[PDB]
């Protein structure tokens, strides 16, 4: 099973200048809980944005060019990325925009954080078709001293 996990600001913005400009510790904790002990697939730009391997996960990087770091696994196509995960119950696709576009048609589950924040961005989560997806979990949180915007955790499953 393939799942996508992402945090979206208003208008599906996910990034600007190869960064995420907000800081929401509760959402990063949600990301860690839902990805730990699973393989994570990311594109090369997202690898550069994170800047180091994510511990406790098999890190798989898509790039058309040879890898430059043997602490992670480098692959050259979507099918190779999936194969490199092996026989696991759930593969997590962690972006960015170009990678989400390619994996969305193959995904059964979306883990989305909707952040109440207006962000100028240059990268968006794919337009997906709402009729294709059922919301099976949602949890709203007001802003607090640690998290400066309200946010909603949602899990959707392909109908
Ligand atoms: N809010 C969130 O949830 C979230 C999550 C992830 C990322 N982001 C943000 O998203 C942005 C990065 O997204 P992006 O769309 O620019 O880039 P990306 O999807 O991270 O990376 C694209 C790169 O991945 C490689 N690639 C993708 N598909 C491939 C394929 N089928 N075969 C081989 N290589 C492939 C290519 O690398 P080569 O050029 O080396 O061939 C391509 O240039 C950043 O702003 C980041 O902060 C946000
Ligand atoms: N919901 C969501 N939020 C994100 O921030 C996110 N980020 C990415 C890609 N970028 C990043 C950037 C940093 C870390 C990171 O530092 N993660 C630590 C945080 C642990 C914690 O804060 O408790 C990790 O071990 O996962 C992960 C992904 C992909 N999907 C996402 N999905
Ligand atoms: Mn092929
Ligand atoms: Mn197999
Ligand atoms: Mn806000």
From Swiss-Prot:
SUPFAM superfamilies: Dihydrofolate reductase-like. NADP(+) binds at residues 7, 13-19, 45-46, 63-64, 76, 95-102. Changing residue 85 to A: Decreases catalytic rate by one third. Increases catalytic rate about 7-fold. Substrate binds at residues 5, 27, 52, 57, 113. Changing residue 92 to F: No effect. Increases catalytic rate about 7-fold. One of its GO terms (biological process) is 10-formyltetrahydrofolate biosynthetic process. Changing residue 30 to G: In strain: 1810. Pathway: Cofactor biosynthesis; tetrahydrofolate biosynthesis; 5,6,7,8-tetrahydrofolate from 7,8-dihydrofolate: step 1/1. One of its GO terms (cellular component) is cytosol. GO terms for molecular function: dihydrofolate reductase activity; dihydrofolic acid binding; folic acid binding; methotrexate binding; NADP binding; NADP+ binding; NADPH binding. CDD domains: DHFR (cd00209). Pfam families: DHFR_1. Its EC number is 1.5.1.3. Changing residue 20 to I/V: Increases catalytic rate 2-fold. Residues 1-158 form the DHFR domain. The keyword Nucleus does not apply. It catalyses: (6S)-5,6,7,8-tetrahydrofolate + NADP(+) = 7,8-dihydrofolate + NADPH + H(+). Key enzyme in folate metabolism. Catalyzes an essential reaction for de novo glycine and purine synthesis, and for DNA precursor synthesis. NCBIfam families: PRK10769.1. This is Dihydrofolate reductase. The gene is folA.
């Amino acid at each position: 099973m393939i799942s996508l996990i992402a945090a979206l600001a208003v208008d599906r913005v996910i990034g600007m200048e190869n960064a995420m400009p907000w800081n929401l510790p509760a959402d990063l904790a949600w990301f860690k809980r839902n990805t730990l002990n699973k393989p994570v697939i990311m594109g090369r730009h997202t690898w550069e944005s994170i800047g180091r391997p994510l511990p406790g996960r098999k890190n798989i990087i898509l790039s058309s060019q040879p890898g430059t770091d043997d602490r992670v696994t480098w692959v050259k196509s979507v099918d190779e990325a999936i194969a490199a995960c092996g026989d696991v119950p759930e593969i997590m696709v962690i972006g960015g925009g170009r990678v989400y576009e390619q994996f969305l048609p193959k995904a059964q589950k979306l883990y989305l954080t909707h952040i109440d924040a207006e962000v100028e961005g240059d990268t968006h989560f794919p337009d997906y078709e709402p009729d294709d997806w059922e919301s099976v979990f949602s949890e709203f949180h007001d802003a607090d001293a640690q998290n400066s915007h309200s946010y909603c955790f949602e899990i959707l499953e392909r109908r």
